[PDB]
mmCIF file with all atom_site columns, N, CA and C in Angstrom:
data_model
loop_
_atom_site.group_PDB
_atom_site.id
_atom_site.type_symbol
_atom_site.label_atom_id
_atom_site.label_alt_id
_atom_site.label_comp_id
_atom_site.label_asym_id
_atom_site.label_entity_id
_atom_site.label_seq_id
_atom_site.pdbx_PDB_ins_code
_atom_site.Cartn_x
_atom_site.Cartn_y
_atom_site.Cartn_z
_atom_site.occupancy
_atom_site.B_iso_or_equiv
_atom_site.pdbx_formal_charge
_atom_site.auth_seq_id
_atom_site.auth_comp_id
_atom_site.auth_asym_id
_atom_site.auth_atom_id
_atom_site.pdbx_PDB_model_num
ATOM 1   N N  . UNK A 1 1  ? -2.265  14.593  10.833  1.00 35.40 ? 1124 UNK A N  1
ATOM 2   C CA . UNK A 1 1  ? -1.934  14.746  9.288   1.00 35.40 ? 1124 UNK A CA 1
ATOM 3   C C  . UNK A 1 1  ? -1.138  14.443  8.282   1.00 35.40 ? 1124 UNK A C  1
ATOM 4   N N  . UNK A 1 2  ? -0.302  13.341  8.652   1.00 35.05 ? 1125 UNK A N  1
ATOM 5   C CA . UNK A 1 2  ? 0.272   12.561  7.515   1.00 35.05 ? 1125 UNK A CA 1
ATOM 6   C C  . UNK A 1 2  ? -0.596  11.575  7.051   1.00 35.05 ? 1125 UNK A C  1
ATOM 7   N N  . UNK A 1 3  ? -0.578  11.461  5.929   1.00 34.93 ? 1126 UNK A N  1
ATOM 8   C CA . UNK A 1 3  ? -1.100  10.702  4.988   1.00 34.93 ? 1126 UNK A CA 1
ATOM 9   C C  . UNK A 1 3  ? -0.480  9.347   4.678   1.00 34.93 ? 1126 UNK A C  1
ATOM 10  N N  . UNK A 1 4  ? -1.278  8.134   4.829   1.00 33.54 ? 1127 UNK A N  1
ATOM 11  C CA . UNK A 1 4  ? -0.714  6.780   4.213   1.00 33.54 ? 1127 UNK A CA 1
ATOM 12  C C  . UNK A 1 4  ? -1.202  6.236   3.020   1.00 33.54 ? 1127 UNK A C  1
ATOM 13  N N  . UNK A 1 5  ? -0.926  5.224   2.586   1.00 29.89 ? 1128 UNK A N  1
ATOM 14  C CA . UNK A 1 5  ? -1.320  4.239   1.010   1.00 29.89 ? 1128 UNK A CA 1
ATOM 15  C C  . UNK A 1 5  ? -2.176  3.414   2.230   1.00 29.89 ? 1128 UNK A C  1
ATOM 16  N N  . UNK A 1 6  ? -3.021  3.454   1.345   1.00 32.13 ? 1129 UNK A N  1
ATOM 17  C CA . UNK A 1 6  ? -4.470  2.537   1.916   1.00 32.13 ? 1129 UNK A CA 1
ATOM 18  C C  . UNK A 1 6  ? -4.945  2.121   0.683   1.00 32.13 ? 1129 UNK A C  1
ATOM 19  N N  . UNK A 1 7  ? -5.474  0.635   0.738   1.00 33.46 ? 1130 UNK A N  1
ATOM 20  C CA . UNK A 1 7  ? -5.888  0.004   -0.211  1.00 33.46 ? 1130 UNK A CA 1
ATOM 21  C C  . UNK A 1 7  ? -7.208  0.628   -1.139  1.00 33.46 ? 1130 UNK A C  1
ATOM 22  N N  . UNK A 1 8  ? -7.347  0.524   -1.992  1.00 31.61 ? 1131 UNK A N  1
ATOM 23  C CA . UNK A 1 8  ? -8.642  1.150   -2.699  1.00 31.61 ? 1131 UNK A CA 1
ATOM 24  C C  . UNK A 1 8  ? -9.685  0.175   -3.497  1.00 31.61 ? 1131 UNK A C  1
ATOM 25  N N  . UNK A 1 9  ? -8.844  -1.332  -3.048  1.00 33.75 ? 1132 UNK A N  1
ATOM 26  C CA . UNK A 1 9  ? -9.955  -2.443  -3.498  1.00 33.75 ? 1132 UNK A CA 1
ATOM 27  C C  . UNK A 1 9  ? -9.397  -3.602  -2.849  1.00 33.75 ? 1132 UNK A C  1
ATOM 28  N N  . UNK A 1 10 ? -9.445  -4.794  -2.781  1.00 31.66 ? 1133 UNK A N  1
ATOM 29  C CA . UNK A 1 10 ? -8.870  -5.817  -2.195  1.00 31.66 ? 1133 UNK A CA 1
ATOM 30  C C  . UNK A 1 10 ? -7.525  -5.898  -3.044  1.00 31.66 ? 1133 UNK A C  1
ATOM 31  N N  . UNK A 1 11 ? -6.355  -6.121  -2.632  1.00 33.34 ? 1134 UNK A N  1
ATOM 32  C CA . UNK A 1 11 ? -5.448  -6.402  -3.429  1.00 33.34 ? 1134 UNK A CA 1
ATOM 33  C C  . UNK A 1 11 ? -4.771  -7.878  -3.047  1.00 33.34 ? 1134 UNK A C  1
ATOM 34  N N  . UNK A 1 12 ? -4.743  -8.651  -4.245  1.00 32.94 ? 1135 UNK A N  1
ATOM 35  C CA . UNK A 1 12 ? -4.713  -10.214 -4.157  1.00 32.94 ? 1135 UNK A CA 1
ATOM 36  C C  . UNK A 1 12 ? -3.076  -10.224 -3.318  1.00 32.94 ? 1135 UNK A C  1
ATOM 37  N N  . UNK A 1 13 ? -2.815  -11.342 -2.883  1.00 33.80 ? 1136 UNK A N  1
ATOM 38  C CA . UNK A 1 13 ? -1.450  -11.945 -2.727  1.00 33.80 ? 1136 UNK A CA 1
ATOM 39  C C  . UNK A 1 13 ? -0.709  -12.139 -4.258  1.00 33.80 ? 1136 UNK A C  1
ATOM 40  N N  . UNK A 1 14 ? 0.339   -11.552 -3.764  1.00 33.78 ? 1137 UNK A N  1
ATOM 41  C CA . UNK A 1 14 ? 1.491   -12.215 -4.801  1.00 33.78 ? 1137 UNK A CA 1
ATOM 42  C C  . UNK A 1 14 ? 1.003   -11.463 -6.306  1.00 33.78 ? 1137 UNK A C  1
ATOM 43  N N  . UNK A 1 15 ? 0.691   -9.977  -6.258  1.00 32.30 ? 1138 UNK A N  1
ATOM 44  C CA . UNK A 1 15 ? -0.156  -9.189  -7.348  1.00 32.30 ? 1138 UNK A CA 1
ATOM 45  C C  . UNK A 1 15 ? 0.672   -7.796  -7.218  1.00 32.30 ? 1138 UNK A C  1
ATOM 46  N N  . UNK A 1 16 ? 1.003   -7.972  -8.514  1.00 27.75 ? 1139 UNK A N  1
ATOM 47  C CA . UNK A 1 16 ? 1.794   -6.246  -8.507  1.00 27.75 ? 1139 UNK A CA 1
ATOM 48  C C  . UNK A 1 16 ? 0.997   -5.537  -8.297  1.00 27.75 ? 1139 UNK A C  1
ATOM 49  N N  . UNK A 1 17 ? 1.087   -3.816  -7.653  1.00 28.65 ? 1140 UNK A N  1
ATOM 50  C CA . UNK A 1 17 ? 0.723   -3.026  -7.391  1.00 28.65 ? 1140 UNK A CA 1
ATOM 51  C C  . UNK A 1 17 ? 0.224   -2.314  -8.668  1.00 28.65 ? 1140 UNK A C  1
ATOM 52  N N  . UNK A 1 18 ? -0.684  -1.236  -8.960  1.00 31.34 ? 1141 UNK A N  1
ATOM 53  C CA . UNK A 1 18 ? -1.090  -0.465  -9.874  1.00 31.34 ? 1141 UNK A CA 1
ATOM 54  C C  . UNK A 1 18 ? -1.909  0.749   -9.315  1.00 31.34 ? 1141 UNK A C  1
ATOM 55  N N  . UNK A 1 19 ? -1.904  1.696   -10.020 1.00 28.93 ? 1142 UNK A N  1
ATOM 56  C CA . UNK A 1 19 ? -2.446  3.160   -9.386  1.00 28.93 ? 1142 UNK A CA 1
ATOM 57  C C  . UNK A 1 19 ? -3.913  2.946   -8.913  1.00 28.93 ? 1142 UNK A C  1
ATOM 58  N N  . UNK A 1 20 ? -4.483  2.015   -9.504  1.00 33.73 ? 1143 UNK A N  1
ATOM 59  C CA . UNK A 1 20 ? -5.949  2.415   -9.103  1.00 33.73 ? 1143 UNK A CA 1
ATOM 60  C C  . UNK A 1 20 ? -6.262  1.221   -7.851  1.00 33.73 ? 1143 UNK A C  1
ATOM 61  N N  . UNK A 1 21 ? -5.202  1.007   -7.318  1.00 37.05 ? 1144 UNK A N  1
ATOM 62  C CA . UNK A 1 21 ? -5.102  0.038   -6.343  1.00 37.05 ? 1144 UNK A CA 1
ATOM 63  C C  . UNK A 1 21 ? -4.547  0.798   -4.933  1.00 37.05 ? 1144 UNK A C  1
ATOM 64  N N  . UNK A 1 22 ? -4.419  2.193   -4.784  1.00 35.54 ? 1145 UNK A N  1
ATOM 65  C CA . UNK A 1 22 ? -3.858  2.703   -3.530  1.00 35.54 ? 1145 UNK A CA 1
ATOM 66  C C  . UNK A 1 22 ? -4.372  4.276   -3.610  1.00 35.54 ? 1145 UNK A C  1
ATOM 67  N N  . UNK A 1 23 ? -5.277  4.439   -2.957  1.00 34.29 ? 1146 UNK A N  1
ATOM 68  C CA . UNK A 1 23 ? -5.271  6.035   -2.308  1.00 34.29 ? 1146 UNK A CA 1
ATOM 69  C C  . UNK A 1 23 ? -4.690  5.937   -1.168  1.00 34.29 ? 1146 UNK A C  1
ATOM 70  N N  . UNK A 1 24 ? -4.769  7.670   -0.841  1.00 35.73 ? 1147 UNK A N  1
ATOM 71  C CA . UNK A 1 24 ? -4.152  8.041   0.371   1.00 35.73 ? 1147 UNK A CA 1
ATOM 72  C C  . UNK A 1 24 ? -5.326  8.650   1.513   1.00 35.73 ? 1147 UNK A C  1
ATOM 73  N N  . UNK A 1 25 ? -4.828  8.326   2.502   1.00 36.81 ? 1148 UNK A N  1
ATOM 74  C CA . UNK A 1 25 ? -6.212  8.623   3.481   1.00 36.81 ? 1148 UNK A CA 1
ATOM 75  C C  . UNK A 1 25 ? -5.242  9.359   4.894   1.00 36.81 ? 1148 UNK A C  1
ATOM 76  N N  . UNK A 1 26 ? -5.300  10.011  5.640   1.00 35.91 ? 1149 UNK A N  1
ATOM 77  C CA . UNK A 1 26 ? -5.029  10.487  7.260   1.00 35.91 ? 1149 UNK A CA 1
ATOM 78  C C  . UNK A 1 26 ? -5.807  9.521   7.890   1.00 35.91 ? 1149 UNK A C  1
ATOM 79  N N  . UNK A 1 27 ? -4.707  8.019   8.444   1.00 38.25 ? 1150 UNK A N  1
ATOM 80  C CA . UNK A 1 27 ? -5.172  6.932   9.139   1.00 38.25 ? 1150 UNK A CA 1
ATOM 81  C C  . UNK A 1 27 ? -4.472  6.764   10.419  1.00 38.25 ? 1150 UNK A C  1
ATOM 82  N N  . UNK A 1 28 ? -4.422  6.005   11.057  1.00 39.42 ? 1151 UNK A N  1
ATOM 83  C CA . UNK A 1 28 ? -3.995  5.412   12.439  1.00 39.42 ? 1151 UNK A CA 1
ATOM 84  C C  . UNK A 1 28 ? -3.967  4.233   12.770  1.00 39.42 ? 1151 UNK A C  1
ATOM 85  N N  . UNK A 1 29 ? -2.834  3.161   12.747  1.00 40.90 ? 1152 UNK A N  1
ATOM 86  C CA . UNK A 1 29 ? -1.514  3.666   13.149  1.00 40.90 ? 1152 UNK A CA 1
ATOM 87  C C  . UNK A 1 29 ? -1.068  4.113   11.336  1.00 40.90 ? 1152 UNK A C  1
ATOM 88  N N  . UNK A 1 30 ? 0.148   4.948   11.364  1.00 39.21 ? 1153 UNK A N  1
ATOM 89  C CA . UNK A 1 30 ? 0.558   5.845   10.276  1.00 39.21 ? 1153 UNK A CA 1
ATOM 90  C C  . UNK A 1 30 ? 1.325   4.295   9.198   1.00 39.21 ? 1153 UNK A C  1
ATOM 91  N N  . UNK A 1 31 ? 1.037   4.270   8.008   1.00 39.89 ? 1154 UNK A N  1
ATOM 92  C CA . UNK A 1 31 ? 1.867   3.239   7.292   1.00 39.89 ? 1154 UNK A CA 1
ATOM 93  C C  . UNK A 1 31 ? 2.550   3.653   6.172   1.00 39.89 ? 1154 UNK A C  1
ATOM 94  N N  . UNK A 1 32 ? 2.971   3.168   5.173   1.00 39.57 ? 1155 UNK A N  1
ATOM 95  C CA . UNK A 1 32 ? 3.669   3.603   4.140   1.00 39.57 ? 1155 UNK A CA 1
ATOM 96  C C  . UNK A 1 32 ? 3.388   5.245   3.767   1.00 39.57 ? 1155 UNK A C  1
ATOM 97  N N  . UNK A 1 33 ? 4.275   6.248   3.581   1.00 39.37 ? 1156 UNK A N  1
ATOM 98  C CA . UNK A 1 33 ? 3.437   7.569   3.208   1.00 39.37 ? 1156 UNK A CA 1
ATOM 99  C C  . UNK A 1 33 ? 3.047   7.690   1.602   1.00 39.37 ? 1156 UNK A C  1
ATOM 100 N N  . UNK A 1 34 ? 2.148   8.393   1.503   1.00 38.18 ? 1157 UNK A N  1
ATOM 101 C CA . UNK A 1 34 ? 1.307   8.805   0.350   1.00 38.18 ? 1157 UNK A CA 1
ATOM 102 C C  . UNK A 1 34 ? 2.224   8.835   -0.709  1.00 38.18 ? 1157 UNK A C  1
ATOM 103 N N  . UNK A 1 35 ? 3.251   9.823   -0.225  1.00 39.24 ? 1158 UNK A N  1
ATOM 104 C CA . UNK A 1 35 ? 4.559   10.072  -1.546  1.00 39.24 ? 1158 UNK A CA 1
ATOM 105 C C  . UNK A 1 35 ? 5.057   9.093   -2.023  1.00 39.24 ? 1158 UNK A C  1
ATOM 106 N N  . UNK A 1 36 ? 5.398   7.839   -1.597  1.00 39.79 ? 1159 UNK A N  1
ATOM 107 C CA . UNK A 1 36 ? 5.681   7.008   -2.279  1.00 39.79 ? 1159 UNK A CA 1
ATOM 108 C C  . UNK A 1 36 ? 4.720   5.772   -2.725  1.00 39.79 ? 1159 UNK A C  1
ATOM 109 N N  . UNK A 1 37 ? 3.803   6.358   -3.251  1.00 39.08 ? 1160 UNK A N  1
ATOM 110 C CA . UNK A 1 37 ? 2.674   5.532   -4.353  1.00 39.08 ? 1160 UNK A CA 1
ATOM 111 C C  . UNK A 1 37 ? 3.439   5.391   -5.440  1.00 39.08 ? 1160 UNK A C  1
ATOM 112 N N  . UNK A 1 38 ? 4.161   6.460   -5.937  1.00 39.09 ? 1161 UNK A N  1
ATOM 113 C CA . UNK A 1 38 ? 4.774   6.511   -7.410  1.00 39.09 ? 1161 UNK A CA 1
ATOM 114 C C  . UNK A 1 38 ? 5.806   4.986   -7.427  1.00 39.09 ? 1161 UNK A C  1
ATOM 115 N N  . UNK A 1 39 ? 6.433   5.014   -6.284  1.00 36.51 ? 1162 UNK A N  1
ATOM 116 C CA . UNK A 1 39 ? 7.548   4.167   -5.776  1.00 36.51 ? 1162 UNK A CA 1
ATOM 117 C C  . UNK A 1 39 ? 7.215   2.535   -6.049  1.00 36.51 ? 1162 UNK A C  1
ATOM 118 N N  . UNK A 1 40 ? 5.505   2.474   -5.345  1.00 36.59 ? 1163 UNK A N  1
ATOM 119 C CA . UNK A 1 40 ? 5.267   1.015   -5.138  1.00 36.59 ? 1163 UNK A CA 1
ATOM 120 C C  . UNK A 1 40 ? 4.704   0.643   -6.384  1.00 36.59 ? 1163 UNK A C  1
ATOM 121 N N  . UNK A 1 41 ? 4.601   1.324   -7.433  1.00 34.72 ? 1164 UNK A N  1
ATOM 122 C CA . UNK A 1 41 ? 3.992   0.583   -8.526  1.00 34.72 ? 1164 UNK A CA 1
ATOM 123 C C  . UNK A 1 41 ? 4.882   -0.648  -9.067  1.00 34.72 ? 1164 UNK A C  1
ATOM 124 N N  . UNK A 1 42 ? 4.382   -1.633  -9.294  1.00 33.96 ? 1165 UNK A N  1
ATOM 125 C CA . UNK A 1 42 ? 4.794   -2.639  -10.046 1.00 33.96 ? 1165 UNK A CA 1
ATOM 126 C C  . UNK A 1 42 ? 5.348   -4.014  -8.757  1.00 33.96 ? 1165 UNK A C  1
ATOM 127 N N  . UNK A 1 43 ? 5.399   -3.283  -7.621  1.00 36.65 ? 1166 UNK A N  1
ATOM 128 C CA . UNK A 1 43 ? 5.837   -3.728  -6.752  1.00 36.65 ? 1166 UNK A CA 1
ATOM 129 C C  . UNK A 1 43 ? 4.774   -4.900  -5.990  1.00 36.65 ? 1166 UNK A C  1
ATOM 130 N N  . UNK A 1 44 ? 5.212   -5.957  -5.340  1.00 36.85 ? 1167 UNK A N  1
ATOM 131 C CA . UNK A 1 44 ? 4.070   -6.940  -4.968  1.00 36.85 ? 1167 UNK A CA 1
ATOM 132 C C  . UNK A 1 44 ? 3.786   -7.321  -3.365  1.00 36.85 ? 1167 UNK A C  1
ATOM 133 N N  . UNK A 1 45 ? 2.699   -7.212  -3.276  1.00 37.71 ? 1168 UNK A N  1
ATOM 134 C CA . UNK A 1 45 ? 2.679   -7.385  -1.663  1.00 37.71 ? 1168 UNK A CA 1
ATOM 135 C C  . UNK A 1 45 ? 2.778   -8.854  -1.559  1.00 37.71 ? 1168 UNK A C  1
ATOM 136 N N  . UNK A 1 46 ? 3.178   -9.389  -0.375  1.00 35.73 ? 1169 UNK A N  1
ATOM 137 C CA . UNK A 1 46 ? 3.307   -10.499 -0.050  1.00 35.73 ? 1169 UNK A CA 1
ATOM 138 C C  . UNK A 1 46 ? 2.006   -11.433 1.199   1.00 35.73 ? 1169 UNK A C  1
ATOM 139 N N  . UNK A 1 47 ? 0.988   -10.698 1.054   1.00 35.51 ? 1170 UNK A N  1
ATOM 140 C CA . UNK A 1 47 ? -0.206  -11.529 1.754   1.00 35.51 ? 1170 UNK A CA 1
ATOM 141 C C  . UNK A 1 47 ? -1.245  -10.314 1.026   1.00 35.51 ? 1170 UNK A C  1
ATOM 142 N N  . UNK A 1 48 ? -2.616  -11.329 1.163   1.00 32.22 ? 1171 UNK A N  1
ATOM 143 C CA . UNK A 1 48 ? -3.515  -10.280 0.521   1.00 32.22 ? 1171 UNK A CA 1
ATOM 144 C C  . UNK A 1 48 ? -3.942  -8.912  1.400   1.00 32.22 ? 1171 UNK A C  1
ATOM 145 N N  . UNK A 1 49 ? -4.430  -7.960  0.926   1.00 32.82 ? 1172 UNK A N  1
ATOM 146 C CA . UNK A 1 49 ? -4.659  -6.534  1.404   1.00 32.82 ? 1172 UNK A CA 1
ATOM 147 C C  . UNK A 1 49 ? -5.875  -6.314  1.620   1.00 32.82 ? 1172 UNK A C  1
ATOM 148 N N  . UNK A 1 50 ? -6.963  -6.455  2.296   1.00 32.87 ? 1173 UNK A N  1
ATOM 149 C CA . UNK A 1 50 ? -8.354  -5.986  2.056   1.00 32.87 ? 1173 UNK A CA 1
ATOM 150 C C  . UNK A 1 50 ? -8.620  -4.538  1.733   1.00 32.87 ? 1173 UNK A C  1
ATOM 151 N N  . UNK A 1 51 ? -9.870  -4.655  1.141   1.00 34.69 ? 1174 UNK A N  1
ATOM 152 C CA . UNK A 1 51 ? -9.967  -2.868  1.158   1.00 34.69 ? 1174 UNK A CA 1
ATOM 153 C C  . UNK A 1 51 ? -10.158 -2.093  2.136   1.00 34.69 ? 1174 UNK A C  1
ATOM 154 N N  . UNK A 1 52 ? -9.545  -1.103  2.140   1.00 34.01 ? 1175 UNK A N  1
ATOM 155 C CA . UNK A 1 52 ? -9.257  -0.070  3.232   1.00 34.01 ? 1175 UNK A CA 1
ATOM 156 C C  . UNK A 1 52 ? -8.295  -0.270  4.339   1.00 34.01 ? 1175 UNK A C  1
ATOM 157 N N  . UNK A 1 53 ? -7.441  -1.393  3.928   1.00 30.59 ? 1176 UNK A N  1
ATOM 158 C CA . UNK A 1 53 ? -6.052  -1.674  4.644   1.00 30.59 ? 1176 UNK A CA 1
ATOM 159 C C  . UNK A 1 53 ? -5.394  -0.648  4.970   1.00 30.59 ? 1176 UNK A C  1
ATOM 160 N N  . UNK A 1 54 ? -4.642  -0.019  5.543   1.00 28.54 ? 1177 UNK A N  1
ATOM 161 C CA . UNK A 1 54 ? -3.105  0.817   5.457   1.00 28.54 ? 1177 UNK A CA 1
ATOM 162 C C  . UNK A 1 54 ? -2.066  0.077   5.052   1.00 28.54 ? 1177 UNK A C  1
ATOM 163 N N  . UNK A 1 55 ? -1.442  0.142   4.150   1.00 28.25 ? 1178 UNK A N  1
ATOM 164 C CA . UNK A 1 55 ? -0.362  -0.524  3.273   1.00 28.25 ? 1178 UNK A CA 1
ATOM 165 C C  . UNK A 1 55 ? 0.975   -0.331  4.527   1.00 28.25 ? 1178 UNK A C  1
ATOM 166 N N  . UNK A 1 56 ? 1.394   -0.992  5.108   1.00 27.47 ? 1179 UNK A N  1
ATOM 167 C CA . UNK A 1 56 ? 2.630   -0.923  6.064   1.00 27.47 ? 1179 UNK A CA 1
ATOM 168 C C  . UNK A 1 56 ? 3.912   -1.648  5.146   1.00 27.47 ? 1179 UNK A C  1
ATOM 169 N N  . UNK A 1 57 ? 5.025   -1.216  5.463   1.00 27.30 ? 1180 UNK A N  1
ATOM 170 C CA . UNK A 1 57 ? 6.291   -1.736  4.926   1.00 27.30 ? 1180 UNK A CA 1
ATOM 171 C C  . UNK A 1 57 ? 6.461   -3.354  4.933   1.00 27.30 ? 1180 UNK A C  1
ATOM 172 N N  . UNK A 1 58 ? 5.734   -3.866  6.005   1.00 28.35 ? 1181 UNK A N  1
ATOM 173 C CA . UNK A 1 58 ? 6.600   -5.139  5.828   1.00 28.35 ? 1181 UNK A CA 1
ATOM 174 C C  . UNK A 1 58 ? 5.565   -6.081  4.899   1.00 28.35 ? 1181 UNK A C  1
ATOM 175 N N  . UNK A 1 59 ? 4.905   -5.562  4.257   1.00 27.78 ? 1182 UNK A N  1
ATOM 176 C CA . UNK A 1 59 ? 3.333   -6.183  2.953   1.00 27.78 ? 1182 UNK A CA 1
ATOM 177 C C  . UNK A 1 59 ? 4.152   -5.882  1.638   1.00 27.78 ? 1182 UNK A C  1
ATOM 178 N N  . UNK A 1 60 ? 5.011   -5.325  1.581   1.00 27.69 ? 1183 UNK A N  1
ATOM 179 C CA . UNK A 1 60 ? 5.630   -5.235  0.460   1.00 27.69 ? 1183 UNK A CA 1
ATOM 180 C C  . UNK A 1 60 ? 6.781   -5.687  -0.041  1.00 27.69 ? 1183 UNK A C  1
ATOM 181 N N  . UNK A 1 61 ? 6.801   -6.643  -0.932  1.00 28.36 ? 1184 UNK A N  1
ATOM 182 C CA . UNK A 1 61 ? 8.263   -7.327  -1.380  1.00 28.36 ? 1184 UNK A CA 1
ATOM 183 C C  . UNK A 1 61 ? 9.400   -6.285  -1.947  1.00 28.36 ? 1184 UNK A C  1
ATOM 184 N N  . UNK A 1 62 ? 10.327  -6.182  -1.386  1.00 28.62 ? 1185 UNK A N  1
ATOM 185 C CA . UNK A 1 62 ? 11.458  -5.335  -1.754  1.00 28.62 ? 1185 UNK A CA 1
ATOM 186 C C  . UNK A 1 62 ? 11.177  -3.562  -1.096  1.00 28.62 ? 1185 UNK A C  1
ATOM 187 N N  . UNK A 1 63 ? 10.407  -3.289  -0.596  1.00 29.19 ? 1186 UNK A N  1
ATOM 188 C CA . UNK A 1 63 ? 10.007  -1.887  -0.104  1.00 29.19 ? 1186 UNK A CA 1
ATOM 189 C C  . UNK A 1 63 ? 11.207  -1.947  1.433   1.00 29.19 ? 1186 UNK A C  1
ATOM 190 N N  . UNK A 1 64 ? 11.948  -0.767  1.120   1.00 28.10 ? 1187 UNK A N  1
ATOM 191 C CA . UNK A 1 64 ? 12.901  0.020   2.040   1.00 28.10 ? 1187 UNK A CA 1
ATOM 192 C C  . UNK A 1 64 ? 12.428  1.491   1.890   1.00 28.10 ? 1187 UNK A C  1
ATOM 193 N N  . UNK A 1 65 ? 12.233  2.384   2.755   1.00 24.36 ? 1188 UNK A N  1
ATOM 194 C CA . UNK A 1 65 ? 12.149  3.729   2.585   1.00 24.36 ? 1188 UNK A CA 1
ATOM 195 C C  . UNK A 1 65 ? 13.688  4.461   2.476   1.00 24.36 ? 1188 UNK A C  1
#
């Protein structure tokens, strides 16, 4: 029942995250926790993230839990 951040649209490379890009969903494997969505705003991804992909810690520049 742990929810993760999932891409609500394709997120292009080297693009700053906004709220409309991030939804929460119970997926496996588990990625960045959904509660970290506010922290992620304005952070950039280091690769394109397709629609429906779980955001993982290694995808986000500067992310540490």
